[PDB]
Amino acid sequence: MVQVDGGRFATSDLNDLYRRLINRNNRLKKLLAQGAPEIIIRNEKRMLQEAVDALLDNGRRGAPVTNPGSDRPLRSLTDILSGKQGRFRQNLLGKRVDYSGRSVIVVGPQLKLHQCGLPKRMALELFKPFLLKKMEEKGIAPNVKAARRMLERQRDIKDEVWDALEEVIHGKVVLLNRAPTLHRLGIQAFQPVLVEGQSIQLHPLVCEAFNADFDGDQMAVHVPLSSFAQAEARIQMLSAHNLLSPASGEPLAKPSRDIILGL
Amino acid sequence: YTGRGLSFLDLIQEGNQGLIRAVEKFEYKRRFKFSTYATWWIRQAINRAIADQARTIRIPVHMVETINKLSRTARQLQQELGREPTYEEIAEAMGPGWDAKRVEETLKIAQEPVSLETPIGDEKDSFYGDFIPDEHLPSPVDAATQSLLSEELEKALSKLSEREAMVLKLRKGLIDGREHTLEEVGAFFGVTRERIRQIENKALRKLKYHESRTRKLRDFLD
């Protein structure tokens, strides 16, 4: 039962079910203590059973229990743990992650097969802790807190921050992703190249594997952190290493429309 | 009484309790039929149950009656003035002891909490809980700066003497978690109350000198 910024209170639906169950149980206890007739006690026991059923699995038997003033059924434990929006498929099999960005993709013809064009500001935000450490190492900032305060305001960022960022990303790679990830080559590791602008530059030869053209597509960027993650991305997931299709064994990064026409 | 927070069967059971009370208190000598006296108790039980069990955040009965009277007065003024009344009219109509501030506070109190599972938009994949951040657990940045401050303060206290550092870390609660007092710290070292106040001040002055000569600790003060 959390209080929102505006002062209003927000609560989950389990509290209402618990309140119903507790009220019915206490009223049954009082009725039993009063020597109530059998009809009243039977009705109260039936309501207690129905309240327990609604708490455990709402809507399975009978009309779903709804919050007064609305027709929306209350969310019970079974509803929490089941469905496409349940705990498993929404929070366990898939999650939202940090050090992740997203932007529109454009074609980069000058890039190598293992390179991609990453905007400077996206790189600054994604590699922020490494950038703060590098800034502390040099004379740009006295400590990490000062560097972070410096990066908070756009007009307070000097020009050596970009050189530090260029130093930080040396050797590292990032994972580019396009949804839906139909096969395993929908996620590919590329060596970022800092570019001016706000759109990601994509190599033409990896478009067929990504199924990505340039009429408005967007892609997500992920930053592996440790040495195991970087080693796996550079050795196994690198774009220049996955040249044949895992399904048929034929080349999948091969000449395409304009290249075929020109040759 | 339906549609006021409680289901029909809950109202029926509360009325059954009231009926049991009426049977207990009924007297047949007065020659009045049972329904006449039982209706009072049934309505009393139902109304008390509504006042006690219709809200997630329970509100006392007197406050519930005040809210109901305020709502009735507001509705009457709204239907008479041909518009939604302001707080001043409502306060004037309620009677003595009522002003706009009290009306606003009562309206603020009468706000029901909103469910965390209310969908927004036609798409059934978004809820209120998806937009409410958790501000209780410290963020990674906060934990990191706390650790950095602790490390830098420990490195700063090394320059102090072996006992002066202990005196400061005891008076500031850096050892047991809770701050001690000069008498309590004095018992630990056998020193009187007054002496500790001077050695602690001297150590604080020395730390100020070191900070002025290094400025490696001013950033953590925000």
């Binding site: 009809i39 039977r42 009705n43 039936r46 038997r61 009978g62 | 069967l9 029926i12």
Partner: peptide
């Protein structure tokens, strides 16, 4: 009367 409807069942029980 109706097994799945509590209100109707209660009314049937009290009607006896």
């Amino acid at each position: 009367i109706s097994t799945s409807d509590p209100v109707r069942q209660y009314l049937h029980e009290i009607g006896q």
